[PDB]
Design a protein around this nucleic acid. Structure first.
Ligand code: SF4
Ligand code: CA
Ligand code: CA
Length: 344
DNA sequence: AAGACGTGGAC
DNA sequence: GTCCAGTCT
């Protein structure tokens, strides 16, 4: 019953829609930035980053024209940093190739780095009205419960089945609003735990609620335990208070972020002294830091730096006052905090 | 295919 | 502790 379902959903949306910062206009640049920031990141976390980012980068061209270091700093702490490297590249392409206009063609837009199926649907359906589905985790959960889809949603194929269902039940009249409303429904009503089925605008059309199994959907494979990785970190300061930091490679974990020199140890002090050579004191703190796919076990070693030559790349000698200008991962932000607390 | 890829809320 | 808010390879 598409029309009945749509009306109960979209009337709910008009009433309950959150007035979020990226909903102030249907501008493709701002829908694109927020769509990328929101990937694997909760709305409440994104709000301050979005506001600061758009303030610093009001247009696609200001983003394209900005130095990679400035764009990364604006992303500092949000996680999954290849999102912002892909976005930066993708806007650069859009300025270079397309004269600064965001393509409204799905296949041309998706050629851009970072633009996967959700981001295509989100930007094109809201900014330009293109009736492409925008299936995020919220939408998969909603559709799994509605149509009692018990397949693993982690499989790409399941996602392709959801995307077909959307095109069938979609309100082609108001696609942008249909897509936001499904997302918003999963965010506000059809939540992972204890979904508010009784309050839900579409309790009638839900096969899961009818069978009493809303809480058992969606079907998501259980995450496997992650590798543990010991990491020795040096905080090396000369007599002028300047600190040695380095820029990580553009490929892999925490790409192009700055860090304090570090070595995967699997004795730390010996490897660190050996690495920076190519004298440290005892450890001052040891803490863990989680990633999605591994856990760092960090150990911080204070050090003294005497200048015997030029500071070569990737390294840079940073006055303590100028550390604030570099983008560090959260793990190394804590390294610096613990080093400064110890110094007190 | 499924591992890589950050981080922080809410249970 | 578990869960979970997308894309590239
Ligand atoms: S009735 Fe419940 S399970 Fe079905 S769409 Fe609404 S909130 Fe989700
Ligand atoms: Ca794509
Ligand atoms: Ca690398």
């Amino acid at each position: 019953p598409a029309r009945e379902f749509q009306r109960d959903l979209l009337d709910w949306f008009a009433r309950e829609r959150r007035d979020l910062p990226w909903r102030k206009d249907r501008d493709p640049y701002k829908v694109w930035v927020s769509s990328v920031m929101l990937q694997q990141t909760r709305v409440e976390t994104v709000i301050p980053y979005f506001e600061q980012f758009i303030d610093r980068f009001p247009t696609l061209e200001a983003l394209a024209d900005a130095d990679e270091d400035e764009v990364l700093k604006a992303w500092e702490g949000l996680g999954y940093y290849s999102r912002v490297r892909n976005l930066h590249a993708a806007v650069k392409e859009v300025k270079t190739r397309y004269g600064g206009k965001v393509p409204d063609d799905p296949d041309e837009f998706s050629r851009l780095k970072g633009v996967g199926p959700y981001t295509v649907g989100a930007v094109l359906s809201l900014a330009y009205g293109v009736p492409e589905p925008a299936v995020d985790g919220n939408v998969m959960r909603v559709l799994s419960r509605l149509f009692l889809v018990t397949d693993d949603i982690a499989k790409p194929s399941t996602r392709k089945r959801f995307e077909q269902i959307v095109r069938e039940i979609m309100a082609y009249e108001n696609p942008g609003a249909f897509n936001e409303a499904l997302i918003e429904l999963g965010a506000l009503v059809c939540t992972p735990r204890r979904p508010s089925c009784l309050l839900c605008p579409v309790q009638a059309y839900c096969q899961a609620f009818a069978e009493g199994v809303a809480e058992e959907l969606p079907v998501k494979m259980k995450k496997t335990a992650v590798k543990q990785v010991p990491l020795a970190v040096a905080v090396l300061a000369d007599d002028e208070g300047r600190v040695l930091i380095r820029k990580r490679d553009s490929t892999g974990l925490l790409a192009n972020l700055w860090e304090f020199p570090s070595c995967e140890t699997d004795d730390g002090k010996e490897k660190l002294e050996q690495m920076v050579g190519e004298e440290l004191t005892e450890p001052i703190v040891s803490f863990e830091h989680a990633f999605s796919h591994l856990v760092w076990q960090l150990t911080v070693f204070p050090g003294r730096l005497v200048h015997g030559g030029p500071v070569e790349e990737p390294y840079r000698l940073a006055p303590e006052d100028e550390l604030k200008a570099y983008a560090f991962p959260v793990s190394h932000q804590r390294v610096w905090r613990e080093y400064k607390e110890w110094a007190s």
